């Protein structure tokens, strides 16, 4: 009902959104292949009133007129695509990416998403799938009586059979790289779908063109730095308290205006 | 009475009386953010332009 | 417009001014009547002798 | 051409200023009373005239 | 009598309606699958006075409340019978009289003869008949409800949970107990499997919480209170002006 109250509402909304970003980063600390988010804010409208630059006194201009502004709006949340710390779990099926690549996965509805989480499983038919049951591309198939699975640093997959001293290559694990990795739309389940702001999927085997190198037995942990999150808690709390103080002051002013 | 209104075609009128400047009645560029200085200088800003 | 009921348009200011003016006009007319009657009876004496 | 831009997810609020209207309500009430005194004074002037 | 009393009365009624909407939003902050309401105010007719140019207003009137159909947060219930919706879609539930309503509350139970019903006891269609000796009920992402039985090493398919999608989600009629019925403004209920044709996915063990943001409601309460005070002051001023007029 009054301008200062709307501006303080926008400020409260921005600080709340910062709190959601912090909480989302914290809840996914243990998530493998997670990237922390950071929100960016911009200024809202600026009422012109006295125009800065308009000529007063015929030969003297007016510098810096009344640019009364409105509150704040968050521009967007950008993910920090940096290399998370590698953790050794000693498993034949965990694959960790050390560079800037993505695994390609086919959703059963027909389209393809992209994931960085490398904890892979085997279905009843022998295909390499994600822990959510989504079949990784390409459809690397593992034989029935496998004794050991070796995923090399170039993405080649070998299976050691009984009675064969030489491993047999059963597939080739590729990495997908994009022009802009922040433009991928996160749909949950550690899955990204390609958008028009993220360019087009560039297939590359691991080691060339930039795709990273695949480590076996390692998992890429989340890059969330938690002490920074606590310091951000302290601010996101004071700033919210101060905006609420502004709301209270405007409320008192309106109350005295009403009471007279 | 200093309540100046802008006509559809850009004429400055007070209470329907066309205001008179140094050159006669004033013709304002149709549609403009009019700013009057401390001595009566009129500055017109056309929408969309810089 | 649905969901709104329109009331009367009687203006009270005009009504109050009308009542005041009507009272003041009635009193003036009473004064004129009194003057005319008094004049008639003064002049009715001219018929004697 | 000179038109405005669109902010999706936001709604423009009213331009009314509450400090502007409450001060006006005070003077309108007082200007209303000072005018009503003119009606009362004129009536008293006319009331004495008809009474004579 | 021509006066400003009605103009401020409409303002008081509009603030009352806004406060009712805010109170309804706050009271349903714990309901699962609740969309917050926002009342839209848009002024009354104008009276035009002709010169030998000016228009006087009449007040403000509520037009229509809109329900915000954004995807609410999920909460973990640890119950195998509860399913939440990721995306836009509605569960279809059959009322006793025969007409089918649409709900988003995913807290379901199994009634005495099998059958999946909502918390109010109304059956969820299609009829999904859970066997008695079921050991674990699994509802897939695409709405396939499979049931495990002791012995058999493969789950048994029982039913499909179809989602009904409306092209205009806001126009549904809220009948009361967390149920919507289709209306002329939200026609053509499109039945689809979850995951295709724009239908949402299903998360088992989670329920969709309410959409009510708290800060907006509190500051809006502050605004409603202060505007109500302002309109009351305007009413008092009109009352005093009329009192001064009548004493002449």
From Swiss-Prot, chain B:
Localisation per UniProt entry: Bacterial flagellum basal body
Top-level lineage group: Bacteria
Transmembrane segments: none
Subunit-level organization: The basal body constitutes a major portion of the flagellar organelle and consists of five rings (E,L,P,S, and M) mounted on a central rod. The rod consists of about 26 subunits of FlgG in the distal portion, and FlgB, FlgC and FlgF are thought to build up the proximal portion of the rod with about 6 subunits each.
Similarity annotation: Belongs to the flagella basal body rod proteins family.
Protein name per Swiss-Prot or TrEMBL: Flagellar basal-body rod protein FlgF
Residues of the full protein shown: 102 to 151 of 251
From Swiss-Prot, chain D:
Top-rank lineage group of the source organism: Bacteria
Gene: flgG
Family designation: Belongs to the flagella basal body rod proteins family.
Species: Salmonella typhimurium (strain LT2 / SGSC1412 / ATCC 700720)
Localization annotation: Bacterial flagellum basal body
Complexes and interactors: The basal body constitutes a major portion of the flagellar organelle and consists of four rings (L,P,S, and M) mounted on a central rod. The rod consists of about 26 subunits of FlgG in the distal portion, and FlgB, FlgC and FlgF are thought to build up the proximal portion of the rod with about 6 subunits each.
Protein name: Flagellar basal-body rod protein FlgG
From Swiss-Prot, chain E:
Lineage: Bacteria, Pseudomonadati, Pseudomonadota, Gammaproteobacteria, Enterobacterales
Protein location: Bacterial flagellum basal body
A Pfam family of this chain: LlgE_F_G_D1
SUBUNIT field: The basal body constitutes a major portion of the flagellar organelle and consists of four rings (L,P,S, and M) mounted on a central rod. The rod consists of about 26 subunits of FlgG in the distal portion, and FlgB, FlgC and FlgF are thought to build up the proximal portion of the rod with about 6 subunits each.
Keyword check for RNA-binding: no
Protein encoded by which gene: flgG
Coiled-coil features, chain-numbered ranges: none
Domain of life: Bacteria
Main location: other
PROSITE patterns on file: FLAGELLA_BB_ROD
Record-given protein name: Flagellar basal-body rod protein FlgG
GO cellular component: bacterial-type flagellum; bacterial-type flagellum basal body, distal rod
NCBIfam families per record: FlgEFG_subfam (TIGR03506), flgG_G_neg (TIGR02488)
Keyword annotations from UniProtKB, A to Z: Bacterial flagellum
GO terms, biological process: bacterial-type flagellum-dependent swarming motility
Record-stated family: Belongs to the flagella basal body rod proteins family.
